[PDB]
Amino acid sequence: AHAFWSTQPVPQTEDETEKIVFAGPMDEPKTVADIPEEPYPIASTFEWWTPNMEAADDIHAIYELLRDNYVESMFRFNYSEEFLQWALCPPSYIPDWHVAVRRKADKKLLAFIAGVPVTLRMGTPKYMKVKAQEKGQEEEAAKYDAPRHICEINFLCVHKQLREKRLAPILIKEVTRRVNRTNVWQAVYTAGVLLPTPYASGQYFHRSLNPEKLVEIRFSGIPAQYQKFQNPMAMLKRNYQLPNAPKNSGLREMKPSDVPQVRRILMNYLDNFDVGPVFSDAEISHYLLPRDGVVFTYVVENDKKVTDFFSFYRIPSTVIILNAAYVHYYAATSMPLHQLILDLLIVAHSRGFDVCNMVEILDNRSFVEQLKFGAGDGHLRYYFYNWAYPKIKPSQVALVML
Numbered sequence: 099a100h101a102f103w104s105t106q107p108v109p110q111t112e113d114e115t116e117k118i119v120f121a122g123p124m125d126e127p128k129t130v131a132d133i134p135e136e137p138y139p140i141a142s143t144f145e146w147w148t149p150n151m152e153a154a155d156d157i158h159a160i161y162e163l164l165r166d167n168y169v170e171s172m173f174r175f176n177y178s179e180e181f182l183q184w185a186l187c188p189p190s191y192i193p194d195w196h197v198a199v200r201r202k203a204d205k206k207l208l209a210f211i212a213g214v215p216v217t218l219r220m221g222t223p224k225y226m227k228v229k230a231q232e233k234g235q236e237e238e239a240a241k242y243d244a245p246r247h248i249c250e251i252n253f254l255c256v257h258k259q260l261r262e263k264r265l266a267p268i269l270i271k272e273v274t275r276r277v278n279r280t281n282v283w284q285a286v287y288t289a290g291v292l293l294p295t296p297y298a299s300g301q302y303f304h305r306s307l308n309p310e311k312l313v314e315i316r317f318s319g320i321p322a323q324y325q326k327f328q329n330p331m332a333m334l335k336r337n338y339q340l341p342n343a344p345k346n347s348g349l350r351e352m353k354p355s356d357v358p359q360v361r362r363i364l365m366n367y368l369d370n371f372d373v374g375p376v377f378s379d380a381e382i383s384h385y386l387l388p389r390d391g392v393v394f395t396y397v398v399e400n401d402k403k404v405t406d407f408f409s410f411y412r413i414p415s416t417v418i419i420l421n422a423a424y425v426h427y428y429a430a431t432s433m434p435l436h437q438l439i440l441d442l443l444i445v446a447h448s449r450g451f452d453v454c455n456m457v458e459i460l461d462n463r464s465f466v467e468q469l470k471f472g473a474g475d476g477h478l479r480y481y482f483y484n485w486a487y488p489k490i491k492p493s494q495v496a497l498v499m500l
Protein backbone atom coordinates (compact mmCIF):
# COMPACT_ATOMS: atom_id res chain seq x y z
CA ALA A 99 0.00 0.00 0.00
CA HIS A 100 0.92 3.69 -0.30
CA ALA A 101 -1.04 5.26 2.55
CA PHE A 102 0.25 8.75 1.66
CA TRP A 103 0.93 8.70 -2.07
CA SER A 104 -2.45 7.14 -2.84
CA THR A 105 -4.01 10.37 -1.60
CA GLN A 106 -1.96 12.74 -3.78
CA PRO A 107 -2.34 14.09 -7.40
CA VAL A 108 0.29 11.81 -8.95
CA PRO A 109 -0.30 8.89 -11.34
CA GLN A 110 -1.06 5.77 -9.36
CA THR A 111 0.24 3.02 -11.67
CA GLU A 112 2.82 2.62 -14.39
CA ASP A 113 -0.04 1.60 -16.69
CA GLU A 114 -1.60 5.11 -16.00
CA THR A 115 1.57 6.81 -17.39
CA GLU A 116 1.79 4.51 -20.51
CA LYS A 117 -1.77 5.67 -21.37
CA ILE A 118 -1.39 9.43 -20.67
CA VAL A 119 -1.60 11.25 -23.93
CA PHE A 120 -1.31 15.00 -23.10
CA ALA A 121 0.64 16.96 -20.53
CA GLY A 122 -1.50 18.90 -18.02
CA PRO A 123 -2.70 19.14 -14.45
CA MET A 124 -4.20 16.27 -12.56
CA ASP A 125 -6.31 18.20 -9.99
CA GLU A 126 -9.05 20.51 -11.21
CA PRO A 127 -8.02 24.10 -10.66
CA LYS A 128 -7.93 25.81 -7.29
CA THR A 129 -7.43 29.41 -6.23
CA VAL A 130 -4.86 30.82 -3.74
CA ALA A 131 -7.87 31.79 -1.47
CA ASP A 132 -8.82 28.08 -1.33
CA ILE A 133 -5.47 27.38 0.47
CA PRO A 134 -5.11 28.12 4.22
CA GLU A 135 -2.33 30.31 5.65
CA GLU A 136 -2.26 28.34 8.92
CA PRO A 137 0.58 25.77 8.72
CA TYR A 138 -0.38 22.11 8.59
CA PRO A 139 -0.91 20.63 12.08
CA ILE A 140 2.01 18.94 13.79
CA ALA A 141 2.42 17.52 17.24
CA SER A 142 2.71 19.87 20.20
CA THR A 143 6.35 19.02 20.91
CA PHE A 144 7.31 20.44 17.44
CA GLU A 145 7.19 23.74 15.63
CA TRP A 146 7.52 24.81 12.06
CA TRP A 147 10.63 26.89 11.35
CA THR A 148 11.63 28.85 8.23
CA PRO A 149 15.43 29.04 8.34
CA ASN A 150 17.08 32.31 7.31
CA MET A 151 19.66 31.37 4.70
CA GLU A 152 21.45 34.72 5.34
CA ALA A 153 22.20 33.49 8.91
CA ALA A 154 25.25 31.35 9.51
CA ASP A 155 23.67 29.54 12.46
CA ASP A 156 20.62 28.51 10.49
CA ILE A 157 22.58 27.14 7.57
CA HIS A 158 24.79 25.36 10.12
CA ALA A 159 21.76 23.65 11.68
CA ILE A 160 20.62 22.43 8.21
CA TYR A 161 24.16 21.21 7.48
CA GLU A 162 24.26 19.18 10.72
CA LEU A 163 20.84 17.55 10.14
CA LEU A 164 21.78 16.45 6.59
CA ARG A 165 25.30 15.42 7.64
CA ASP A 166 23.95 12.72 9.96
CA ASN A 167 20.52 11.94 8.51
CA TYR A 168 20.47 12.32 4.75
CA VAL A 169 20.93 9.65 1.95
CA GLU A 170 23.27 6.69 2.91
CA SER A 171 29.08 1.73 4.46
CA MET A 172 32.67 2.88 4.03
CA PHE A 173 31.75 6.38 2.62
CA ARG A 174 29.50 9.25 3.76
CA PHE A 175 28.49 12.08 1.38
CA ASN A 176 29.38 15.58 2.70
CA TYR A 177 27.10 18.39 1.53
CA SER A 178 28.91 21.47 2.76
CA GLU A 179 27.23 24.66 3.91
CA GLU A 180 28.49 26.24 0.65
CA PHE A 181 27.02 23.45 -1.46
CA LEU A 182 23.70 23.76 0.40
CA GLN A 183 23.74 27.61 -0.03
CA TRP A 184 24.22 27.15 -3.70
CA ALA A 185 21.58 24.45 -4.18
CA LEU A 186 18.92 26.08 -1.96
CA CYS A 187 19.32 29.79 -2.80
CA PRO A 188 19.11 30.41 -6.55
CA PRO A 189 17.85 33.72 -7.95
CA SER A 190 14.48 34.75 -6.60
CA TYR A 191 14.28 31.79 -4.21
CA ILE A 192 11.28 31.89 -1.92
CA PRO A 193 12.49 31.77 1.72
CA ASP A 194 9.42 29.98 3.11
CA TRP A 195 9.81 27.14 0.61
CA HIS A 196 12.64 26.04 2.90
CA VAL A 197 10.52 24.16 5.45
CA ALA A 198 11.94 22.84 8.76
CA VAL A 199 10.57 21.15 11.88
CA ARG A 200 12.30 21.86 15.18
CA ARG A 201 11.70 20.50 18.67
CA LYS A 202 10.32 23.36 20.75
CA ALA A 203 11.99 22.46 24.00
CA ASP A 204 15.58 22.74 22.79
CA LYS A 205 15.18 24.07 19.23
CA LYS A 206 16.80 20.92 17.78
CA LEU A 207 16.29 20.69 13.97
CA LEU A 208 14.57 17.35 13.26
CA ALA A 209 13.23 17.51 9.67
CA PHE A 210 13.63 19.53 6.52
CA ILE A 211 12.42 19.79 2.91
CA ALA A 212 13.22 22.46 0.33
CA GLY A 213 11.56 23.87 -2.72
CA VAL A 214 13.26 26.24 -5.15
CA PRO A 215 11.84 27.95 -8.21
CA VAL A 216 12.57 26.44 -11.62
CA THR A 217 11.19 27.39 -15.03
CA LEU A 218 10.57 24.13 -16.88
CA ARG A 219 9.51 23.12 -20.34
CA MET A 220 7.07 20.29 -19.60
CA GLY A 221 4.53 20.31 -22.40
CA THR A 222 3.43 17.22 -24.34
CA PRO A 223 6.47 15.27 -25.51
CA LYS A 224 7.38 15.02 -29.15
CA TYR A 225 6.23 11.45 -29.72
CA MET A 226 2.83 12.23 -28.09
CA LYS A 227 2.34 15.32 -30.22
CA VAL A 228 2.75 13.16 -33.34
CA LYS A 229 -0.05 10.86 -32.06
CA ALA A 230 -2.21 13.94 -31.33
CA GLN A 231 -1.65 15.38 -34.82
CA GLU A 232 -2.92 12.07 -36.28
CA LYS A 233 -6.15 12.49 -34.24
CA GLY A 234 -6.72 16.20 -34.93
CA GLN A 235 -5.90 16.95 -31.21
CA GLU A 236 -2.89 19.20 -31.84
CA GLU A 237 -4.49 21.98 -29.86
CA GLU A 238 -5.11 19.85 -26.71
CA ALA A 239 -1.48 18.59 -27.05
CA ALA A 240 0.07 22.04 -27.36
CA LYS A 241 -1.88 23.80 -24.55
CA TYR A 242 0.93 23.60 -22.01
CA ASP A 243 3.96 24.14 -24.25
CA ALA A 244 4.98 27.46 -22.65
CA PRO A 245 7.75 27.03 -20.01
CA ARG A 246 6.09 26.97 -16.57
CA HIS A 247 7.34 28.54 -13.32
CA ILE A 248 7.15 25.59 -10.88
CA CYS A 249 8.80 24.22 -7.74
CA GLU A 250 11.79 21.82 -7.66
CA ILE A 251 11.91 19.80 -4.43
CA ASN A 252 15.04 18.37 -2.86
CA PHE A 253 16.70 17.58 0.49
CA LEU A 254 13.78 15.88 2.17
CA CYS A 255 15.18 14.62 5.46
CA VAL A 256 13.67 13.28 8.71
CA HIS A 257 16.12 12.84 11.63
CA LYS A 258 16.68 9.15 12.44
CA GLN A 259 15.02 9.57 15.84
CA LEU A 260 11.75 10.55 14.09
CA ARG A 261 11.67 7.88 11.32
CA GLU A 262 8.52 5.77 10.58
CA LYS A 263 6.31 8.33 12.22
CA ARG A 264 4.66 9.61 9.01
CA LEU A 265 6.49 12.94 9.33
CA ALA A 266 7.62 12.95 5.67
CA PRO A 267 3.96 13.15 4.49
CA ILE A 268 3.40 16.13 6.84
CA LEU A 269 6.55 17.93 5.46
CA ILE A 270 5.29 17.25 1.87
CA LYS A 271 1.80 18.54 2.66
CA GLU A 272 3.23 21.70 4.31
CA VAL A 273 5.62 22.58 1.45
CA THR A 274 2.76 21.88 -1.00
CA ARG A 275 0.58 24.40 0.88
CA ARG A 276 3.39 27.05 0.83
CA VAL A 277 3.98 26.53 -2.90
CA ASN A 278 0.22 26.67 -3.61
CA ARG A 279 0.01 29.97 -1.63
CA THR A 280 2.25 31.45 -4.33
CA ASN A 281 -0.16 30.26 -7.06
CA VAL A 282 2.16 27.38 -8.13
CA TRP A 283 0.53 23.99 -8.51
CA GLN A 284 3.20 21.63 -9.96
CA ALA A 285 6.56 20.39 -8.74
CA VAL A 286 9.42 18.26 -10.09
CA TYR A 287 11.48 15.98 -7.87
CA THR A 288 13.71 12.90 -8.12
CA ALA A 289 14.49 9.92 -5.98
CA GLY A 290 16.63 6.81 -6.09
CA VAL A 291 13.65 4.74 -4.89
CA LEU A 292 10.48 3.84 -6.83
CA LEU A 293 7.40 5.86 -5.81
CA PRO A 294 4.10 6.39 -7.69
CA THR A 295 4.96 7.10 -10.54
CA PRO A 296 8.04 8.28 -12.45
CA TYR A 297 7.86 9.82 -15.89
CA ALA A 298 11.49 8.82 -16.56
CA SER A 299 14.24 6.64 -15.00
CA GLY A 300 17.96 6.65 -15.78
CA GLN A 301 20.83 4.52 -14.58
CA TYR A 302 23.90 6.08 -13.01
CA PHE A 303 27.37 5.80 -14.63
CA HIS A 304 30.84 6.38 -13.22
CA ARG A 305 34.32 6.88 -14.64
CA SER A 306 37.38 6.32 -12.49
CA LEU A 307 39.88 9.18 -12.64
CA ASN A 308 42.39 8.03 -10.03
CA PRO A 309 42.04 4.26 -9.90
CA GLU A 310 45.06 3.79 -7.61
CA LYS A 311 43.44 6.05 -5.04
CA LEU A 312 40.02 4.47 -5.49
CA VAL A 313 41.45 1.05 -4.90
CA GLU A 314 43.56 2.18 -1.85
CA ILE A 315 40.43 3.70 -0.18
CA ARG A 316 38.35 0.61 -1.14
CA PHE A 317 35.90 2.57 -3.20
CA SER A 318 36.76 0.40 -6.23
CA GLY A 319 38.25 -2.99 -6.44
CA ILE A 320 40.44 -4.50 -9.03
CA PRO A 321 37.92 -6.34 -11.19
CA ALA A 322 38.17 -10.16 -11.41
CA GLN A 323 39.40 -10.15 -15.02
CA TYR A 324 42.27 -7.77 -14.37
CA GLN A 325 43.47 -10.20 -11.67
CA LYS A 326 44.75 -12.43 -14.48
CA PHE A 327 47.25 -9.78 -15.72
CA GLN A 328 50.91 -9.79 -14.54
CA ASN A 329 50.39 -6.23 -13.26
CA PRO A 330 46.66 -5.73 -12.53
CA MET A 331 47.03 -2.17 -11.21
CA ALA A 332 49.22 -1.00 -14.14
CA MET A 333 46.54 -2.30 -16.49
CA LEU A 334 43.82 -0.55 -14.49
CA LYS A 335 45.81 2.75 -14.46
CA ARG A 336 46.28 2.23 -18.20
CA ASN A 337 42.50 1.80 -18.92
CA TYR A 338 41.78 5.08 -17.16
CA GLN A 339 44.90 7.18 -17.99
CA LEU A 340 44.24 10.76 -19.16
CA PRO A 341 46.40 13.50 -20.70
CA ASN A 342 47.85 16.03 -18.28
CA ALA A 343 46.20 18.95 -20.13
CA PRO A 344 43.50 19.34 -22.71
CA LYS A 345 44.45 20.05 -26.31
CA ASN A 346 41.47 22.30 -27.30
CA SER A 347 42.67 25.80 -28.01
CA GLY A 348 40.73 28.47 -26.17
CA LEU A 349 39.55 26.28 -23.26
CA ARG A 350 39.54 28.27 -19.99
CA GLU A 351 37.55 28.77 -16.79
CA MET A 352 34.23 30.51 -17.36
CA LYS A 353 34.13 34.21 -16.34
CA PRO A 354 31.20 36.53 -15.64
CA SER A 355 31.49 38.07 -19.10
CA ASP A 356 30.74 34.68 -20.66
CA VAL A 357 27.26 34.42 -19.05
CA PRO A 358 25.15 35.69 -22.00
CA GLN A 359 26.83 33.46 -24.58
CA VAL A 360 26.75 30.40 -22.26
CA ARG A 361 23.04 31.05 -21.69
CA ARG A 362 22.44 31.15 -25.53
CA ILE A 363 24.34 28.02 -26.42
CA LEU A 364 22.92 26.04 -23.48
CA MET A 365 19.33 27.06 -24.19
CA ASN A 366 19.70 26.24 -27.89
CA TYR A 367 20.87 22.71 -26.88
CA LEU A 368 18.35 22.09 -24.09
CA ASP A 369 15.44 23.04 -26.40
CA ASN A 370 16.09 19.60 -28.10
CA PHE A 371 14.69 17.75 -25.12
CA ASP A 372 11.11 17.14 -23.95
CA VAL A 373 11.65 18.21 -20.34
CA GLY A 374 14.26 20.77 -19.39
CA PRO A 375 14.93 24.06 -17.62
CA VAL A 376 14.92 27.57 -18.99
CA PHE A 377 17.59 29.74 -17.35
CA SER A 378 17.87 33.50 -17.17
CA ASP A 379 21.31 35.15 -17.13
CA ALA A 380 21.05 35.38 -13.33
CA GLU A 381 20.39 31.67 -13.11
CA ILE A 382 23.29 30.86 -15.48
CA SER A 383 25.50 33.01 -13.25
CA HIS A 384 24.31 31.30 -10.08
CA TYR A 385 24.42 27.71 -11.28
CA LEU A 386 27.43 27.80 -13.58
CA LEU A 387 30.01 30.42 -12.52
CA PRO A 388 32.97 28.69 -10.79
CA ARG A 389 32.58 28.42 -6.99
CA ASP A 390 35.45 26.98 -4.94
CA GLY A 391 34.64 23.46 -3.69
CA VAL A 392 31.31 23.32 -5.47
CA VAL A 393 31.05 24.10 -9.19
CA PHE A 394 33.65 24.05 -11.97
CA THR A 395 32.84 25.47 -15.39
CA TYR A 396 34.95 25.90 -18.51
CA VAL A 397 34.26 27.50 -21.89
CA VAL A 398 35.95 27.09 -25.27
CA GLU A 399 36.28 30.62 -26.54
CA ASN A 400 38.18 32.13 -29.45
CA ASP A 401 37.88 35.48 -31.11
CA LYS A 402 35.55 36.51 -28.24
CA LYS A 403 32.99 33.84 -29.28
CA VAL A 404 32.11 31.07 -26.86
CA THR A 405 31.46 27.90 -28.87
CA ASP A 406 31.33 25.22 -26.17
CA PHE A 407 31.20 24.82 -22.42
CA PHE A 408 31.02 22.20 -19.76
CA SER A 409 30.35 22.14 -16.02
CA PHE A 410 30.66 19.70 -13.20
CA TYR A 411 29.82 19.98 -9.49
CA ARG A 412 31.58 18.40 -6.54
CA ILE A 413 30.20 16.20 -3.81
CA PRO A 414 33.01 14.90 -1.59
CA SER A 415 32.65 11.80 0.64
CA THR A 416 34.23 11.04 4.01
CA VAL A 417 36.03 7.74 3.91
CA ILE A 418 34.98 6.13 7.11
CA ILE A 419 38.34 12.02 1.18
CA LEU A 420 36.79 10.74 -2.07
CA ASN A 421 36.47 13.69 -4.39
CA ALA A 422 33.58 13.04 -6.91
CA ALA A 423 32.75 15.23 -9.92
CA TYR A 424 29.15 15.12 -11.29
CA VAL A 425 28.56 16.11 -14.96
CA HIS A 426 26.36 19.17 -14.87
CA TYR A 427 25.26 21.12 -18.01
CA TYR A 428 27.27 21.38 -21.19
CA ALA A 429 26.90 22.38 -24.83
CA ALA A 430 29.16 21.47 -27.80
CA THR A 431 29.09 23.34 -31.11
CA SER A 432 32.72 23.19 -32.36
CA MET A 433 33.77 19.64 -31.51
CA PRO A 434 32.15 16.25 -30.92
CA LEU A 435 30.60 15.91 -27.49
CA HIS A 436 33.01 13.10 -26.58
CA GLN A 437 35.97 15.50 -26.99
CA LEU A 438 34.32 18.19 -24.87
CA ILE A 439 33.67 15.58 -22.12
CA LEU A 440 37.23 14.19 -22.48
CA ASP A 441 38.32 17.73 -21.63
CA LEU A 442 35.98 17.64 -18.60
CA LEU A 443 37.65 14.41 -17.44
CA ILE A 444 41.15 15.82 -17.97
CA VAL A 445 40.35 19.05 -16.06
CA ALA A 446 38.61 17.16 -13.21
CA HIS A 447 41.54 14.78 -12.93
CA SER A 448 44.00 17.69 -12.89
CA ARG A 449 42.09 19.37 -10.06
CA GLY A 450 42.23 16.22 -7.99
CA PHE A 451 38.91 14.61 -8.56
CA ASP A 452 38.86 10.81 -8.13
CA VAL A 453 35.76 9.73 -10.07
CA CYS A 454 33.24 11.37 -12.46
CA ASN A 455 29.56 10.45 -12.12
CA MET A 456 26.42 11.09 -14.22
CA VAL A 457 22.98 9.79 -14.96
CA GLU A 458 22.06 8.83 -18.54
CA ILE A 459 20.04 12.04 -19.16
CA LEU A 460 20.87 14.61 -21.89
CA ASP A 461 23.28 13.01 -24.43
CA ASN A 462 25.31 11.38 -21.72
CA ARG A 463 25.02 7.90 -23.27
CA SER A 464 26.76 9.05 -26.40
CA PHE A 465 30.26 9.06 -24.85
CA VAL A 466 29.99 6.23 -22.33
CA GLU A 467 31.97 3.51 -24.05
CA GLN A 468 34.66 5.62 -25.62
CA LEU A 469 35.35 7.53 -22.34
CA LYS A 470 35.34 4.34 -20.20
CA PHE A 471 32.24 5.04 -18.14
CA GLY A 472 30.60 1.99 -16.54
CA ALA A 473 27.02 1.51 -15.50
CA GLY A 474 26.44 1.50 -11.68
CA ASP A 475 23.76 -0.01 -9.51
CA GLY A 476 21.62 3.05 -8.97
CA HIS A 477 18.69 4.58 -10.95
CA LEU A 478 17.46 8.14 -10.66
CA ARG A 479 13.70 8.40 -11.14
CA TYR A 480 12.07 11.74 -12.20
CA TYR A 481 8.62 12.66 -10.96
CA PHE A 482 6.07 15.41 -11.29
CA TYR A 483 3.51 16.48 -8.72
CA ASN A 484 0.12 17.34 -10.17
CA TRP A 485 1.16 16.84 -13.78
CA ALA A 486 -0.02 14.07 -16.14
CA TYR A 487 2.86 13.25 -18.39
CA PRO A 488 3.65 10.34 -20.73
CA LYS A 489 6.57 8.05 -19.90
CA ILE A 490 9.68 9.28 -21.69
CA LYS A 491 13.22 7.98 -22.08
CA PRO A 492 15.90 9.52 -19.82
CA SER A 493 17.65 10.86 -22.94
CA GLN A 494 14.65 13.22 -23.29
CA VAL A 495 15.31 14.74 -19.86
CA ALA A 496 17.58 17.82 -19.67
CA LEU A 497 17.06 18.70 -15.99
CA VAL A 498 20.14 17.94 -13.86
CA MET A 499 19.21 17.39 -10.19
CA LEU A 500 21.77 18.60 -7.59
Ligand SMILES: CCCCCCCCCCCCCC(=O)CSCCNC(=O)CCNC(=O)[C@H](O)C(C)(C)COP(=O)(O)OP(=O)(O)OC[C@H]1O[C@@H](n2cnc3c(N)ncnc32)[C@H](O)[C@@H]1OP(=O)(O)O
Pocket residue numbers: 099100101102103104167168169170249251252253254255256257260261262263264265266267270273274277278282283284285287288289290291293483484
Ligand atom coordinates in the same frame (compact mmCIF):
# COMPACT_ATOMS: atom_id res chain seq x y z
C1 LIG B 1 2.84 21.95 -5.92
C2 LIG B 1 4.06 21.79 -5.01
C3 LIG B 1 4.23 20.31 -4.60
C4 LIG B 1 5.47 20.23 -3.67
C5 LIG B 1 5.71 18.77 -3.14
C6 LIG B 1 5.96 17.75 -4.31
C7 LIG B 1 6.22 16.33 -3.75
C8 LIG B 1 7.59 16.18 -3.09
C9 LIG B 1 7.80 14.75 -2.58
C10 LIG B 1 9.13 14.57 -1.81
C11 LIG B 1 10.37 14.52 -2.80
C12 LIG B 1 11.68 14.50 -2.08
C13 LIG B 1 12.80 14.26 -3.10
C14 LIG B 1 14.19 14.44 -2.52
O1 LIG B 1 14.43 15.00 -1.46
C15 LIG B 1 15.39 13.67 -3.18
S1 LIG B 1 15.30 11.84 -2.68
C16 LIG B 1 16.14 11.90 -1.06
C17 LIG B 1 15.06 11.69 0.11
N1 LIG B 1 15.76 11.75 1.42
C18 LIG B 1 16.43 10.74 1.92
O2 LIG B 1 16.43 9.59 1.46
C19 LIG B 1 17.10 11.05 3.28
C20 LIG B 1 17.13 9.87 4.26
N2 LIG B 1 15.79 9.36 4.57
C21 LIG B 1 14.99 10.06 5.37
O3 LIG B 1 15.26 11.21 5.75
C22 LIG B 1 13.59 9.43 5.54
O4 LIG B 1 13.70 8.04 5.39
C23 LIG B 1 12.54 10.01 4.56
C24 LIG B 1 12.39 11.51 4.81
C25 LIG B 1 12.98 9.86 3.09
C26 LIG B 1 11.19 9.26 4.74
O5 LIG B 1 10.79 9.39 6.13
P1 LIG B 1 10.45 8.11 7.00
O6 LIG B 1 10.35 8.48 8.39
O7 LIG B 1 11.33 6.99 6.58
O8 LIG B 1 9.03 7.75 6.45
P2 LIG B 1 7.59 8.38 6.91
O9 LIG B 1 7.81 9.83 7.48
O10 LIG B 1 6.96 7.34 7.86
O11 LIG B 1 6.84 8.48 5.55
C27 LIG B 1 6.74 7.32 4.72
C28 LIG B 1 6.16 7.84 3.39
O12 LIG B 1 7.22 8.58 2.82
C29 LIG B 1 7.35 8.17 1.46
N3 LIG B 1 8.74 8.39 1.01
C30 LIG B 1 9.88 7.74 1.41
N4 LIG B 1 10.92 8.23 0.73
C31 LIG B 1 10.46 9.21 -0.09
C32 LIG B 1 11.11 10.02 -1.01
N5 LIG B 1 12.46 9.93 -1.28
N6 LIG B 1 10.33 10.92 -1.64
C33 LIG B 1 8.96 11.00 -1.48
N7 LIG B 1 8.34 10.21 -0.62
C34 LIG B 1 9.09 9.31 0.09
C35 LIG B 1 7.07 6.67 1.53
O13 LIG B 1 6.75 6.13 0.24
C36 LIG B 1 5.86 6.69 2.43
O14 LIG B 1 4.66 7.02 1.72
P3 LIG B 1 3.62 5.85 1.40
O15 LIG B 1 3.14 5.25 2.69
O16 LIG B 1 2.44 6.42 0.54
O17 LIG B 1 4.36 4.78 0.46
